[PDB]
């Protein structure tokens, strides 16, 4: 969801943890919060 | 075939190990998506690179080409795969920390068994083991190439907008989650499909090159338009099969 | 449990044990069907802690990437059916000798021309591995292989890793304790954690001098001992020759080793003889890694363009 410079060596990569906690809201906005939110909230897929 | 080892046609996928033990084609697709889901979730919690996640997602997709979902549950393999991917992508997390994060995601209410309990020390073993099994099943082929790489590179070469380039990378990640493209097409091609897809959502048209070649001809040689529309179609088919929620909360409100 | 891509080691017949390591460490073998001689290295797992040693995963990941003439070649990775434990084996193309043994044997002889090729092959291997952003980190005679046909190979990437071409941003924090004591560069002995290619090149120099001395030129017993020897040979480590070397937390520990004059060429004079040879060993054994010559420029040093030019290694390998 957040592009990264391919040129960057692996260990130089940035964490995948979004910058803001994930809410309990299910709106257009929160549905695109991060990958996890998009997958679970927008599409409705879950591992539990 | 060593370069073709982990690539399968539609028919070949038509028959997987899982299928062998009576698992419906769709049933398997979900186990896959779900595994991606848990992998991404555990990944963000351990805060590893999205590179690590992508890698584990593939280790997982290839893994279930040999082993069955029946004998190895996604919720068991996922934590092992990620734990491995983390070492491969040079952002290693301690075994404990992964175990904890997994427990948290799979057992929200319960509490982390004492780091001395047999219940705990047991899974430390199970994980280490599933690890070596994962290694042996992938035939130690650890280096993975993802579409993301080619997506970024291309969006830059076509002066793609900021968010268009972002949407593009966003699809590349969805292709690893929602589809099996990583078992059917090479990254470069996937990347083209991801971009083609975004431009379709954003009405962005990439003009032909000042040398006459189409944009994708700068990503991979084998790609054609026909291919793009066909694969974009399948990706939509997959998207339309998820119990897609948005369609209902799609407009009403925002928040704070 | 299918394992279509991890053949069982059985396919190989253990012909003998290579060197005196552990019970089932390194083994010479023959493919029961092609008779192919291969070297079997077991992934030792006493580091039974965090699962499959990351350090191993690296070796393998790296070995499968580096495909160059002067780099040992990894054939496949075999296993041994497990039960109460499981083991993993790396199958390498078997290599006849190691530079350590050849130089050990008071019998083997090298012509300046022959040394020149050993060296040119070593540096060519390094240049390749380094151009693929890979640090060997375990340079030493014992890991420099030579085939029956006289081809050099860099071996044991068990301590190897990737490195970043980051002239750009943030400094890198790589593992400090690496490289056997006797072949360890000063930068590391001072605690450096932002090193790069130059560490392998310092080994390349310790090795090159060995071709003439027939034994490790600096054999410390402790890290401080090592530093002392290095000082006695390359000269005292001071900010004069090493811009900003003061900042090393560990430097403030060299206080008593401060008067040595660079005796490099002098101490190796009696052994090397050839001028250009004394020169490249001098440029490789440079204290400040930033001033230390690299693989590329070493490959263009006069020592590689002056009579006697490089000749194969048949002579040295003279039937045995």
């Amino acid at each position: 969801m957040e592009p990264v410079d391919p040129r960057l060596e692996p260990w130089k990569h940035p964490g995948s943890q979004p910058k803001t906690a994930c809410t309990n809201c299910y709106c257009k906005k929160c549905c695109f919060h991060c990958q996890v939110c998009f997958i679970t909230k927008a599409l409705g897929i879950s591992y539990g | 075939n060593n370069n073709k080892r982990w690539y399968f046609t539609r028919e070949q996928l038509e028959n997987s190990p899982s299928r062998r033990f009576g698992v419906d084609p769709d049933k398997e697709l979900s186990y896959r998506q779900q595994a991606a889901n848990l992998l991404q979730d555990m990944g963000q919690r351990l805060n590893v690179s999205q590179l690590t996640i992508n890698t584990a997602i593939v280790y997982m997709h290839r893994f279930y080409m040999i082993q069955s979902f029946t004998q190895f549950p996604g919720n068991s393999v996922a934590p092992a795969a990620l734990f491995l991917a983390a070492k491969v992508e040079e952002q290693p997390k301690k075994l404990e920390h992964v175990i904890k994060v997994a427990h948290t995601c799979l057992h929200p209410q319960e509490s982390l068994p004492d780091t001395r309990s047999e219940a705990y020390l047991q899974q430390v073993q199970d994980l280490v083991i599933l690890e070596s099994i994962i290694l042996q099943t992938l035939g130690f082929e650890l280096t993975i190439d993802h579409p993301h790489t080619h997506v970024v590179k291309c969006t830059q070469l076509v002066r793609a907008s900021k968010d268009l380039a972002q949407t593009s990378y966003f699809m590349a990640t969805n292709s690893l989650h929602l589809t099996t493209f990583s078992l059917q097409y090479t990254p470069p091609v996937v990347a083209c499909v991801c971009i083609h897809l975004a431009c379709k959502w954003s009405n962005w048209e990439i003009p032909v090159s000042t040398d006459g070649k189409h944009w994708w001809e700068y990503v991979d040689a084998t790609v054609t338009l026909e291919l793009l529309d066909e694969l974009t179609h399948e990706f939509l088919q997959i998207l339309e099969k998820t119990p897609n929620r948005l369609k209902r909360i799609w407009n009403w409100r925002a928040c704070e | 449990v299918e394992c279509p891509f991890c053949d069982e080691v059985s396919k190989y017949e253990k012909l003998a044990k290579i060197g005196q390591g552990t019970f089932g460490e390194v083994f010479k073998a023959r493919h029961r069907k092609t008779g192919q001689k291969v070297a079997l290295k077991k992934v030792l797992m006493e580091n039974e802690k965090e699962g499959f040693p990351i350090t191993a995963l690296r070796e393998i990941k790296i070995l499968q990437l580096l495909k160059h003439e002067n780099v040992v070649n990894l054939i496949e990775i075999c296993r041994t059916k497990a039960s109460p434990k499981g083991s993993i084996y790396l199958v390498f193309d078997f290599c006849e000798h190691d530079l350590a043994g050849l130089l050990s044997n008071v019998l083997v002889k090298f012509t300046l021309s022959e040394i020149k090729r050993v060296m040119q092959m070593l540096l060519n291997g390094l240049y390749y591995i380094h151009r693929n952003k890979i640090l060997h980190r375990d340079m030493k005679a014992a890991n420099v292989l030579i085939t029956r046909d006289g081809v050099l190979k860099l071996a044991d990437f068990g301590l190897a890793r990737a490195f970043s071409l980051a002239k750009n941003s943030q400094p890198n924090r790589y593992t400090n304790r690496v490289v056997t004591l006797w072949y360890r560069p000063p930068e590391l002995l001072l605690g450096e954690r932002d090193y790069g290619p130059p560490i392998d090149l310092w080994g390349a120099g310790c090795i090159m001098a060995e071709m003439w001395t027939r034994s490790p030129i600096m054999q410390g017993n402790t890290e401080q001992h090592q530093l002392a020897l290095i000082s006695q040979l390359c000269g005292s480590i001071t900010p004069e020759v090493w811009p900003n070397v003061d900042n090393y937390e560990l430097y403030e520990k060299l206080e008593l080793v401060k008067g040595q004059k660079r005796k490099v060429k002098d101490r190796l004079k009696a052994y090397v003889r050839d001028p250009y040879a004394l020169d490249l060993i001098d440029k490789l054994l440079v204290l400040d890694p930033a001033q230390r010559i690299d693989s590329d420029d070493a490959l263009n040093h006069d020592f590689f363009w002056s009579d006697p030019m490089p000749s194969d290694l048949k002579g040295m390998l003279s039937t045995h």
Binding site: H33 | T167, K200, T232, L239 | -
Partner: protein, 38 residues
């Protein structure tokens, strides 16, 4: 001169592929800014 002109909006359409991807995720210009941190 650059190798590629800049991407241009082609919103005059009868494109099933686009309609489809739209009905799934919503209008791009609306959602677009929520995607990700930046």
């Amino acid at each position: 001169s650059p190798l590629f002109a800049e991407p241009y909006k082609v919103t005059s359409k009868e494109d099933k592929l686009s309609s489809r991807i739209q009905s799934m995720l919503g209008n791009y210009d609306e959602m677009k800014d929520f995607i990700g941190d930046r």
